[PDB]
Design a protein around this ligand. Structure first.
Ligand SMILES: CC(C)c1cc(C(=O)N2Cc3ccccc3C2)c(O)cc1CC#N
Length: 219
């Protein structure tokens, strides 16, 4: 046999970018401070999932073909005690590559900035969703967050950040999710209570009791 060397690939498959400084300041703030009620992170994710589900639901009024990718609108929650992850998957509208990079790395600048200003003036962490940036509350409990997303008009993409100032984005060739978003939280060691059935049930019942979509726990 011969030994080729592929000196160049079709396109750079992993890209790394810095957050806007304001986004990174918030993330650093969130991942390092004490908050007495970190369970709000699940409310924030379920809230973003509900909106993504509304978005595909309303386009399905006008185009029934937008669900050939999946007709059930639902949220699933999967704690995995042995890999210390908690996973939320929704069948909402998902995100193109352009919006993945933009929404999470860049145009969150306004909301994160107004929020840190509001914090200086007396706000607290639970109000983060009033500024459109509730997703970053995941770092209350996670040391590392992964986002897998699939929009009807694009391929599947993976996003990842450990809150070190940077994130990466790559074409994800993994479990095809069809459509929507999947979030994988790599939990801090002192936050393993969100891998128990009792507790996750408490948090959903306490905060997301009136979401208009089924939420299913896969213990
Ligand atoms: C990465 C975060 C921000 C996230 C994004 C989506 C998502 O694809 N959209 C698309 C869309 C369209 C309209 C209104 C809102 C949304 C949010 C999701 O379904 C779940 C999460 C998890 C959290 N928190």
């Amino acid at each position: 046999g011969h030994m080729p060397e592929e000196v160049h690939h079709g396109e750079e498959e992993v890209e790394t970018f810095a957050f806007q400084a304001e986004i990174a300041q918030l993330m650093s703030l969130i991942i390092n401070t004490f908050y007495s009620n970190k369970e709000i992170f699940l409310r924030e994710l379920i809230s973003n999932a509900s909106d993504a589900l509304d978005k595909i639901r309303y386009e399905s009024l006008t185009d029934p073909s937008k669900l050939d990718s999946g007709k059930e609108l639902k949220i699933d929650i999967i704690p995995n005690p042995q890999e210390r992850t908690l996973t939320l998957v929704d069948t909402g509208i998902g995100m193109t590559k352009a919006d993945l990079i933009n929404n999470l790395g860049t145009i969150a600048k306004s909301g994160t900035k107004a929020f840190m200003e509001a914090l200086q003036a007396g706000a607290d962490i639970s109000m983060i969703g009033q500024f459109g940036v509730g997703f970053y509350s995941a770092y209350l409990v996670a040391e590392k967050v992964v986002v897998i997303t699939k929009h009807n008009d694009d391929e599947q993409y993976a996003w990842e950040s450990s809150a070190g100032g940077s994130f990466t984005v790559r074409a994800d060739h993994g479990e095809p999710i069809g459509r929507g978003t999947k979030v994988i939280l790599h939990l801090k060691e002192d936050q393993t209570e969100y891998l128990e059935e009792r507790r996750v049930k408490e948090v959903v019942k306490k905060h997301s009791q009136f979401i208009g979509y089924p939420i299913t726990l896969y213990l």
